[PDB]
Amino acid sequence: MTSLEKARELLREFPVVDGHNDLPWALREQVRYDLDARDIAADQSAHLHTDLARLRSGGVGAQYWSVYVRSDLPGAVTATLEQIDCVRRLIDRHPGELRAALTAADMEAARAEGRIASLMGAEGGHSIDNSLATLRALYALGVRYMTLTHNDNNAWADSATDEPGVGGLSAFGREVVREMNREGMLVDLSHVAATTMRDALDTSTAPVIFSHSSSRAVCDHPRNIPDDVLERLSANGGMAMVTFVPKFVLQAAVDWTAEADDNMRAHGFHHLDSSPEAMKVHAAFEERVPRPVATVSTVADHLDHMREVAGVDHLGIGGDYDGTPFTPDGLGDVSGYPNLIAELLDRGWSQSDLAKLTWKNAVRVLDAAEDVSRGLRAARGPSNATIEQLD
Ligand SMILES: [Cl-]
Ligand SMILES: [Zn+2]
Ligand SMILES: [Zn+2]
């Protein structure tokens, strides 16, 4: 059989545990949670990267649904609760295809039943409003990982796409990591600055993750992971879940985006300006300079290097589907995973290597978080420290 056929066979036994899908945010923005207007039990290819049929075709066996909310707007806690509610509604609306999962055991139970284990991950520390009790509430509601920052710094952690702030994690930031360790919530280092990554690794007593980040050595961009950080994963026991975002993984895309941003500023616009005037300027740029397109090979290049530095037991996949408008050819939506697995097979990756990449590493890491939590919960009570006290 072909590598693609083999890939599908392998995925049927050990499916993909995707680390980060922003479907909830897409539903919030596109139809304000009017789920009937974007019923994932139907074909949503015209509007979204995600729907049930494509998840099945893609071999996805577990999904960490992101409950991301904007950090530049007030009411982040309320919005996060609405995002969590959206995930719960999706699970309740499609019991035949989805199963809520809070533990590693739940993930295996879902796999045995043929249902997609549905977990939740908060994206950005602003979701807890500098409140440790709020962090605990999110865990109680089912959140199993929290990206310490999104694109902007928060009061206690520095983002990779912002200027230096506290220098990584502040004293309160370390307290947040300690509490996440006690609760059993995975510390997610995607989006954070390299300084923050190192501070988190120094502090965490549990394996950490990168729900959607690739290799900085392969493609120099702050959203990717430096080799020195990848090297620490074996000792920490965590894992880096490679992402597909073109402007992060393809060198030509990183350069193109930088030039596009410069062009925007050349016209007196902030590179993030979305006004009709700004859009006209950007359209003109893309007209004379076509947008580079990434491929499955691009992503495989990252995984090859990540495997070399971090080790096969410390890798995963986090597509960032419905969180980014652009995708690599061959990975246009959630049905594309088999193409990546096929490419890796062609590159010599073994069946066991791939089972770790797709399923086993993720289950091991969540189980580890639970194990560390058992020890810490029995050793001490929860923290009631405030950011004022520590910072
Ligand atoms: Cl992202
Ligand atoms: Zn993200
Ligand atoms: Zn996201």
Boundaries of every domain in the chain? 1-391
Give the number of the ligand closest to the Cα of residue 322.
Answer: 3
Q: Residue 17 forms beta bridges with which residues?
A: 62
From ligand 1's centre to the CA of 61, what distance in Å?
22
The question of whether 302 is a catalytic residue gets the answer no
3-state SS, the chain, equals CCHHHHHHHHHHHCCEEEEEECHHHHHHHHHCCCHHHHCCCCCCCCCCCCCHHHHHHCCEEEEEEECCCCCCCCCHHHHHHHHHHHHHHHHHHCCCCEEECCCHHHHHHHHHHCCEEEEEEEECHHHHCCCHHHHHHHHHCCEEEEECCCCCCCCCECECCCCCCCCCECHHHHHHHHHHHHHCCEEECCCECHHHHHHHHHHCCCCCEECCCCECCCCCCCCCECHHHHCCHHHHCCEEEECCCHHHHCHHHHHHHHHHHHHHHHCCCCCCCCCHHHHHHHHHHHHHCCCCCCEHHHHHHHHHHHHHHHCHHHEEECCCECCCCCCCECCCCCCCHHHHHHHHHHCCCCHHHHHHHHHHHHHHHHHHHHHHHHHHHHHCCCCCCCHHHHC
**Catalytic: which of 320, 322, 333, 343?**
320
| CA dihedral for 51, 52, 56, 59, sign (positive or negative) | positive
Q: Which residue has the tokens 């073109």?
A: 246
**Catalytic: which of 20, 221, 282, 305?**
20
* Listed residue (38, 49, 122) closest to 321, CA to CA: 49
The question of whether 273 is a catalytic residue gets the answer no
From ligand 1's centre to the CA of 202, what distance in Å?
24
Give the tokens for residue 126.
């602003």
From ligand 1's centre to the CA of 20, what distance in Å?
9
> Measured between alpha carbons, how far is 130 from 338 in angstroms, rounded to an integer?
41
> Measured between alpha carbons, how far is 183 from 366 in angstroms, rounded to an integer?
12
Domain 1-391 part of CATH 1.10.3720.10: no
**Catalytic: which of 49, 126, 150, 302?**
150
The question of whether 49 is a catalytic residue gets the answer no
From ligand 3's centre to the CA of 147, what distance in Å?
9
Torsion, CA 194, CA 200, CA 205, CA 208, rounded to 10 = -60
The question of whether 51 is a catalytic residue gets the answer no
Method by which the model was determined: X-ray
The question of whether 162 is a catalytic residue gets the answer no
The question of whether 212 is a catalytic residue gets the answer yes
* Listed residue (72, 73, 85, 97) closest to 32, CA to CA: 85
Phi/psi at 121 (5° precision): -135, 130
From ligand 2's centre to the CA of 247, what distance in Å?
13
152 CB neighbour count, 10 Å cutoff = 17
Binding residue positions for Zn(2+): 20, 22, 123, 191, 212, 320
> Measured between alpha carbons, how far is 113 from 222 in angstroms, rounded to an integer?
40
Torsion, CA 113, CA 117, CA 118, CA 121, rounded to 10 = 160
8 A C-beta contact, residue 315 and residue 241: yes
* Listed residue (6, 4, 22) closest to 245, CA to CA: 22
> Measured between alpha carbons, how far is 210 from 36 in angstroms, rounded to an integer?
32
Give the tokens for residue 307.
């495997």
Mark residue 87 as left, alpha or beta (left: phi above 0; alpha: psi -120 to 50; beta: remaining).
alpha
